[PDB]
Symmetry: C3
């Protein structure tokens, strides 16, 4: 039940390192992913590592929404919801223009681009937030 300086080993218990720790190989942490059909044609692909850092990738295209409106689709599942509202910037493919969405702590998503009419505009980009 001792940890050695060689060999593959499994280690249980809470280990608190008070100093500097270096890893020269790979550090593997939990990863979870989620796809959200957020509404109005917007899709989010979320990847969460260490139950904290989330990178959101925008897909789809948005139409028929105004600033301040919540997207009319599926809310972000509980394990991806941030503790505070997170504003994620995205870009309209092939344009000079951008938008942001807010992912609210309840999982709802609020649109904060300009109003978009019936003509969809492709939405892309990566945004990052911390859950805690």
């Amino acid at each position: 039940n001792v940890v050695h300086k060689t060999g593959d080993e499994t280690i249980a218990g809470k280990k608190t390192f008070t100093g500097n720790v270096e890893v020269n190989g790979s550090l593997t942490l939990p990863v979870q992913t989620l796809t959200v059909e957020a509404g109005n044609g917007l899709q989010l692909q979320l990847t969460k590592k260490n139950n904290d850092l989330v990178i959101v990738r925008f897909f789809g295209s948005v139409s028929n929404i105004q600033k301040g409106w919540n997207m009319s689709g599926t809310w972000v599942d509980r394990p991806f919801r941030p503790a505070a509202v997170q504003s994620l910037v995205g870009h309209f493919a092939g344009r000079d223009t951008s938008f942001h969405i807010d992912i609210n702590p309840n999982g709802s998503i609020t649109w904060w681009g300009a109003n978009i009419d019936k003509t969809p505009i492709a939405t892309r980009g990566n945004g990052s937030y911390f859950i805690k």
Copy 2:
């Protein structure tokens, strides 16, 4: 004075794992937060993990600033300053338009949106940088 394969333990010393490490529970690293009234109505909420990765959340509303001007507010505290100038993109709420700011290693912030006249414009978004961006 020995680390075991069970139990809660505290481990002092620089420990270098030359191979692979996996953590199946939570990995807790240092976290520090700071709110900065940057100037010109712009507010930054910074969260720094592992004295390295920072996510900056923009709040407030900017007015009366020209491109390339330092913002006329509070400088970023030393622990949050990057080693190289970092450009963080933000978005004006309810608009098609965006800006960026440069967070300078000295703690200052430079505005790099368009010139903004006296009417404030709400500023939002998350941007991330490494303090230790270099190998």
Copy 3:
């Protein structure tokens, strides 16, 4: 003695799988690599990759003579920095209200997804993050 101690600087081989919770009060240092890319059309990327997974890209340079959906006509991203899946990274034009994005593709090519840019260079800046895995 081949055991890890609760004191002292020590180097430790073997894959160590911590099935529980781990806390680091000092700094955790993971592998870091950097790359500068003249991506084409004046666009420059400075990339930092940590743990062979998280990448922050920093845009520099000034872009000209590029159309939407065209691949940029410069150096492709070196293999170690390529994402598994296409990653769209938003950038900002310095001193302007306008923005762009590029797609960093799995082969290291980069596709321009701003508006078309004619002969006059516009300065490009900003950070974007992605996971390789």
